[PDB]
Design a protein around this ligand. Structure first.
Ligand code: NA
Lengths: 929, 296, 250
């Protein structure tokens, strides 16, 4: 099935869809089609009714054992009732209680799963896909879901195609059809008529593909599931450790259950009682709510990152973010605000200040002469930025400009200095201007001066000072053109080094009035032809603008320094400017020097400086193209503060490979289509929420919703918390196993009445299975988290002998002793003193001995003893549960004679906490008390 | 140095202009927190060595909450009517009286809330905010219950330090804590201080939402913002929740390291650098250079 | 996993830790017992009515089995009854005071004396008679005592009537009067506060004539005279009741 409109022509496309090829259909028609046709592709997926999910939660896992036990109890009650009359409703009650336990635990599991999956799926609308349509006459940015059939859509380099497109105009556009085909080669697209097969017609832009380069515009033909792509259609270290630990504890629980079943059979137990005790121990000693617990922890953290402008795209990247060890990052937009303002200018040999502002708008110079006149003229006529409409009242510093940040800064500065840049550009005549690119490094424009010369051609151009000077041979001083000698070249170099040394972008401006004899008034300027004398211009001056570091960037750099994370700056800027900005943010720090810095300080030439004496380096991008693997490895190993200046985005992959060859966990920065291989190669590749493109967001594992570098540091710190929250949750779900098995062991050994029954054991487990999840929900961040060296992903384990012992031999023992106290007190206050209970198990459990004596001489019938024993069982369960829950709210805060209840076991917990605080021990397993 | 005490609407607000208006350049307006005035907190920040260069090119307009100014009388019943909306209401009169055009916020705790409400009410007058330890929500339910069960049997000053400093420093009780409880117990009229605290508790949740690109979204601070909070401060979750439900393009979160309680008096060298970069990104003091690059 | 020194350190640490934990537990237990009075339980609501028990306790769940000719089959019952009835003979209760009949013997202060139960009140089942307690003759003797409760004051006339369920053909002769429990012993005050308190007994002798030898009786004893002492319960078959079976082999 492949029928498409590629055979149609441009004129008839206006009739099939009723849209203007340069205007597009109106918003009213778009809304009408959206109401009629429906939403965008949306690829309607299947789903489960979630009642199957609830039934799988109820009947899945080890709850099948409890269901089997309830079935056995009901069967025994039924057979007893059928055989003998007057049946004691005990097996029926036991089965009902067992089924209620299954239902309650299934409800808890389902609620936790629903909460996790509902906190998830809230990240699918944090950065919704966008489409660039030109409906109503302006290029608006409607949501991808609102695109209708017919409206024209423009795609840029790195923008995923919103729907099936038949492009009508192209500017070198290419597409990545690897989603449909098997090749990743960027096939091109043009409005012409290639092969009649729509899959290779070179004029159809398929849905869900990416436009790698160029620009194109086209009419939507298929919106919905009708699209071509719509018609058709392993493990983490944390998960591995948790699965292995769960399997080990499940084996231990099965062994304990078999042993206790055998020992109960030896102790004259009914068959139902033994096969129910075995089930109770097995179900109460297997960690079931642990996968849900780690999922809750990961999802809660990922929600906490998203509130700090760090949108994670996976639950695997949450655990890989806290193990980061290298944050190779860009400089513009990430480490700097990208809000440039003009600060300094150099003309007439004086380094003038561009302070201006409202007060003394003539800072250091009011109007000067033709020097600054030509400087401002070049600045205002070489720009390709304008103020948008409806912004003629707000003051200039608080105005909005469209275009590059540098162009906007220049516009604002010279419009504050001069007046009405708009009238400045309209008074003159702008005819020709070459497009900007990082190949020529100049902005040539042809222009007509209306004052005196009227040459019908001008050479206004701006670019990097080191290259523009190579062509503007002349130089203007005091309004008079003069030859450029070595003295003036040295002065210009000194000015460049002084302005660049402050961490400022510096731009050059050279212009020349072309003679009329070589080119008359009527000339046809052509890019291919030489035409204009691209060289031998006249230097005017230098303009410098600050690009301040972001507000929270130096603090984040300090945090990285303290946390043992190496920050690498990869910038396509001049090495001097890159070094200055790196020193200003903290990626070079104080005392640490470059080899050039040491050479300058010790007055020695650079060569004899020992490279090992410099801990800070600035690698040029052109040089990096020539280092082999070993040289780059040495550079990244011996130097702790590295800056990659003049580095193209393609070499980011080489830098990532070099940093990863040392075992580090590297995090990078996206914002581009050339950064996609690096984002895929790095362990945790980070895209940019605002400045980044669709491809970068597609290939990244993490997105910065505010573009700030400090957000990366905050996300690293947030992900660092899970490696100590997970072990706390494991300890909390493990500590409840000892108060469940110690009663039976002490019963057997000391021959005392049973302190805890099977149903009561199941009640203890049921009431203390939400403690880890609730603790995760109510948790506070630990201090000094960013003062420890990054964790080793392969040589560090969540579970160790110090943690299992912590959970099983100290906290479990404390809680078991508390429960035993609550049992002993209730037995004592009814007549049986604790020393009289030793050896009483045989008589207490004898149905035909109804004269068991107190310590006070009384005599108890069998069913009078069992009432008190059941009271003791219930008290044990209640005490254990309400000390487990109370110690939680007391630990999260501090860091008559029925006092025998939770007040005791809590008191002993605090007392043993004080003891283990006195004995510091040695890292420190004291925070678990 | 002028100490104009302008009166308007629900009371008399005392301001201390420590500067000269540089034409129409925005003047830094400072609001304190509960339990202290401008002298205790902001006079220990605006007097810093690095803060001199910022104040040279700007003006300081230290404002005092009604009744918290030094040497103030009391009222037998008081009835401190100004609520948070009302406390933000008399700021435009203060601006008009002093011939003010635009301001840059300086907000700590209650002052941060007041400045946020003022910016949300009249976005044109506010150029930017640097709200420190801002809480956009009310006391909630569990926190409100804890407040009404613990503060009844506890001194007002002690609850002030509990709100200001973290539990770790409070238990440690280092030199700073008593150096400040001195200035909180004294240098303040308790009769109006308790009324101001009660008004602070009686706050309505600030209406702000993070834009989602969907017309029906709630309004938010369109001005550039910098949220400063110490890593060991009680109002960390409050600021993080305030960092969310806000525009990420304009606002920045500065979780100050090795700090807590009061970032403006504990680590002024880092807050001054953050403030300088915040102002430079907004277009002011463009030739002030870079602090870590200045010493070279 | 080897590491003898590390294992020793682990064992020493756990030794001192569990010593500290046991010290805390023992101190709390001591404080628990100190608040507890040692002459009467703090709570009595769980034992409101006295049960019934027989003596001696058989080895097969209340199944009295003995042989007519074998002196060893009945032996265990014989010296169990001899041991139990030793304090009941006249040679020991001589120091005990005599006691008026038909009224509660309420006591005050530290006097706390106990009435004496004459061993001959059991008639043929007493040990002062033939050494065999009804065995080797054809009339086994079973005691039916009622459980002691501190501060119990039964109302009315308390009596135990053991009526055979075997169609009354082996008629049951309950010896002390018609199974009367004299009310003069009943205000029990617990040990350490009732020194040498001999609880009242009721002896049951089952008629096992040679013609109806073998078989088994189903003597059911219960309290039938006092309203204070409950006798019917849906769960407790011994609350004011008891039921034992005797089989006379050969
Ligand atoms: Na467990």
């Amino acid at each position: 099935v492949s029928m498409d409109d590629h055979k149609l022509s441009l004129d008839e496309l206006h009739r099939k869809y009723g849209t203007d090829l340069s205007r597009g259909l109106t918003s009213a028609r778009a809304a009408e089609i959206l109401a009629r046709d429906g939403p965008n592709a949306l690829t309607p997926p299947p789903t489960t009714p979630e009642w199957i999910k609830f039934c799988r939660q109820l009947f899945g896992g080890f709850s099948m054992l409890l269901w089997i036990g309830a079935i056995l109890c009901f069967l025994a009650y039924s057979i007893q009732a059928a055989t003998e009359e007057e049946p004691q409703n005990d097996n029926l009650y036991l089965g009902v209680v067992l089924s209620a336990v299954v239902i309650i635990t299934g409800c808890f599991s389902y609620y936790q799963e629903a909460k996790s999956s509902k906190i998830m799926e809230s990240f699918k609308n944090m950065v919704p896909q966008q489409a660039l349509v030109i409906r109503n006459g302006e290029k608006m940015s409607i949501n991808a879901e609102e695109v209708v059939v017919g409206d024209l859509v423009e795609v840029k380099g790195g923008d995923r195609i919103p729907a099936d497109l038949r492009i009508i105009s192209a500017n070198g556009c290419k597409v990545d059809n690897s989603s449909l085909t098997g090749e990743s080669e960027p096939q091109t697209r043009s409005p012409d008529f290639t092969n009649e097969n729509p899959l290779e017609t070179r004029n159809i832009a398929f849905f869900s593909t990416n436009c790698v380069e160029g620009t194109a515009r086209g009419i939507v033909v298929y919106t919905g599931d009708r699209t071509v792509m719509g018609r058709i259609a392993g493990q983490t270290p944390i998960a591995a450790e948790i699965e292995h630990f769960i399997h080990i504890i499940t084996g231990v629980a099965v062994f304990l259950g078999v042993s206790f079943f055998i020992l109960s059979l030896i102790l004259e137990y009914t068959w139902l009682e033994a096969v129910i005790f075995l089930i109770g121990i097995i179900v109460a000693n297997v960690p079931e709510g642990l996968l849900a617990t780690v999922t809750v922890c990961l999802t809660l953290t990922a929600k906490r990152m998203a509130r700090k402008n760090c949108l994670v795209k996976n639950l695997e990247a949450v655990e890989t973010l806290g193990s980061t060890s290298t944050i190779c990052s860009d400089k513009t937009g990430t480490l700097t605000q990208n809000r440039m303002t003009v600060a300094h200018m150099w003309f007439d040999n004086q380094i003038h200040e561009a302070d201006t502002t409202e007060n003394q708008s003539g800072v250091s110079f009011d109007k000067t002469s033709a020097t600054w006149l030509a400087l401002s003229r070049i600045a205002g006529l070489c720009n390709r930025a304008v103020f948008q409409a409806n912004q003629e009242n707000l003051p200039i510093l608080k105005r909005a400009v469209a275009g590059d940040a540098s162009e906007s800064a220049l516009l604002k500065c010279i419009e504050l200095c001069c007046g009405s840049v708009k009238e400045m550009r309209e008074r003159y005549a702008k005819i020709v201007e070459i497009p900007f690119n990082s190949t020529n490094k100049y902005q040539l424009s042809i222009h007509k001066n209306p004052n005196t010369s009227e040459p019908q051609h001008l050479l206004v151009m701006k670019g990097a000072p080191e290259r523009i000077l190579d062509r503007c041979s002349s130089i203007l001083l005091h309004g008079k053109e003069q030859p450029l000698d070595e003295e003036l070249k040295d002065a210009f170099q000194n000015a460049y080094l002084e302005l660049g040394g402050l961490g400022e972008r510096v731009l050059g401006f050279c212009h020349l009035f072309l003679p009329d004899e070589q080119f008359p008034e009527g000339f046809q300027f052509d890019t291919d032809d030489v035409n204009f004398p691209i060289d031998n211009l006249c230097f005017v001056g230098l303009i410098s603008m600050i690009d301040p570091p972001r507000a929270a960037v130096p603090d984040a750099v300090g945090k990285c320094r303290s946390a043992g994370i190496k920050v690498i700056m990869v910038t396509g800027d001049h090495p001097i400017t890159a070094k200055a900005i790196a020193k200003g943010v903290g990626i070079i720090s104080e005392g640490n020097e470059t080899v050039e810095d040491i050479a300058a300080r010790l007055n020695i030439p650079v060569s004899q400086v020992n490279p090992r004496d410099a801990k800070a380096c600035v690698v040029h991008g052109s040089d990096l193209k020539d280092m082999t693997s070993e040289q780059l490895d040495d550079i990244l190993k011996y130097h702790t503060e590295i800056v990659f200046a003049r580095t193209s985005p393609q070499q980011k992959l080489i830098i990532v490979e070099g940093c990863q060859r040392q075992g580090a966990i590297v995090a990078v920065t996206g914002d581009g289509v050339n950064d996609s291989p690096a984002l895929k190669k790095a362990d945790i590749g980070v895209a940019m929420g605002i400045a980044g493109s669709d491809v970068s967001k597609q290939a990244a594992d993490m997105i910065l919703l505010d573009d700030n570098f400090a957000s990366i540091v905050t996300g690293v710190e947030e992900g660092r918390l899970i490696f100590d929250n997970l072990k706390k949750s494991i300890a909390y779900t493990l500590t409840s196993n000892i108060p469940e098995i110690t009663p039976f062991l002490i019963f057997i050994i000391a021959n005392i009445p049973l302190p805890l029954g099977t149903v009561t054991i199941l009640c203890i487990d049921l009431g203390t299975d939400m403690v880890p999840a609730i603790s995760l929900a109510y948790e506070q961040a630990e201090s000094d988290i960013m003062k420890r060296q990054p964790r080793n992903p392969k040589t560090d384990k969540l579970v160790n002998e110090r943690l299992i012992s912590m959970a099983y031999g100290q906290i479990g023992m404390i809680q078991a002793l508390g429960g035993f106290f609550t049992y002993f007190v209730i037995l004592a206050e009814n007549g049986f003193l604790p020393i009289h209970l030793l050896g009483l198990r045989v008589d207490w459990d004898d149905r035909w001995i109804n004269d068991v004596e107190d310590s006070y001489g009384q005599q108890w019938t069998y069913e009078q003893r069992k009432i008190v024993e059941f009271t003791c069982h219930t008290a044990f369960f209640v005490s254990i549960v309400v000390v487990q829950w109370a110690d939680l709210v007391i630990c999260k805060t501090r860091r008559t004679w029925w006092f025998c209840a939770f007040p005791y076991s809590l008191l002993i917990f605090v007392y043993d906490k004080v003891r283990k605080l006195i004995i510091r021990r040695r890292v420190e397993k004291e925070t678990y008390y | 140095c002028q100490e104009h005490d302008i009166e308007t609407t629900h009371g008399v607000v005392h301001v201390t202009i420590r500067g000269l208006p540089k034409g129409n350049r925005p003047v830094i307006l400072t609001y304190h927190d509960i339990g202290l005035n401008h002298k205790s907190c902001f006079n220990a920040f605006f007097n810093f060595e690095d803060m001199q260069e910022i104040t040279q090119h700007f003006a300081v307009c230290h404002v005092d909450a009604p009744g918290q100014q030094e040497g103030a009388p009391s009222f037998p019943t008081g009835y401190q009517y100004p609520t948070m909306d009302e406390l933000a209401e008399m700021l435009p009169p203060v601006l008009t009286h002093l011939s003010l055009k635009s301001i840059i916020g300086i907000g700590v705790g209650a002052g941060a809330y007041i400045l946020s409400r003022f910016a949300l009410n009249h976005p044109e007058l506010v150029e930017g905010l640097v709200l420190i330890n801002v809480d956009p929500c009310a006391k909630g339910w569990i926190d409100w219950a804890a407040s009404k069960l613990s503060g009844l049997t506890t001194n007002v000053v002690d609850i002030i330090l509990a709100h200001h400093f973290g539990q770790e420093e409070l238990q440690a009780n280092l030199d700073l804590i008593q150096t400040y409880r001195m200035h909180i117990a004294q240098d303040i009229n308790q009769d109006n201080l308790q009324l101001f605290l009660n008004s602070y508790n009686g706050r309505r949740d600030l209406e702000i939402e993070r834009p989602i690109l969907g017309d029906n979204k709630s309004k938010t601070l369109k001005c550039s913002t910098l949220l400063v909070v110490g890593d060991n401060s009680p109002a960390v979750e409050a600021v993080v929740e305030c960092n969310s439900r806000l525009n990420p393009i304009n606002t920045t979160l500065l979780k100050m390291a090795d700090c807590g309680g009061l970032p403006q008096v504990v680590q002024p060298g880092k807050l001054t650098e953050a403030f300088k970069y915040f102002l430079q990104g907004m277009g002011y003091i463009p030739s002030a250079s870079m602090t870590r690059l200045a010493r070279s | 996993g080897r590491t003898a020194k590390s294992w020793g350190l682990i064992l020493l640490f756990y030794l001192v830790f569990y010593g500290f934990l046991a010290a805390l537990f023992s101190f709390t237990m001591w404080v628990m017992l100190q608040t507890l009075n040692d002459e009467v339980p703090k709570y009595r609501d769980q034992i409101p009515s006295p049960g019934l028990m027989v003596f001696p306790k058989p080895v097969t769940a209340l199944e009295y089995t003995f042989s007519r000719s074998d002196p060893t089959s009945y032996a265990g019952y014989i010296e169990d009854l001899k041991k139990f009835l030793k304090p009941y003979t006249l040679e020991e209760q001589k120091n005990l005071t005599v006691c008026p009949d038909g009224a509660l013997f309420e006591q005050k202060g530290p006097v706390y004396v106990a009435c004496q139960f004459p061993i001959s009140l059991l008639q043929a089942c007493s040990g002062m008679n033939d050494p065999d307690f009804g065995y080797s003759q054809g009339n086994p003797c079973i005691l039916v005592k009622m459980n002691r409760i501190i501060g119990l004051k039964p109302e009315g006339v308390p009596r135990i009537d053991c009526v055979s369920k075997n169609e009354d053909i082996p008629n049951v002769a309950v010896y002390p009067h018609n199974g009367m429990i004299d009310l003069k012993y009943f205000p029990y005050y617990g040990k350490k506060l009732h020194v040498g308190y001999l609880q009242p007994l009721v002896a049951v002798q089952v008629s096992f004539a040679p013609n109806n030898t073998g078989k088994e009786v189903t003597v059911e004893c219960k309290i039938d005279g006092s309203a204070n002492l409950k006798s019917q319960d849906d769960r407790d078959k011994f609350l004011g009741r008891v039921m034992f079976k005797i089989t006379a082999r050969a």
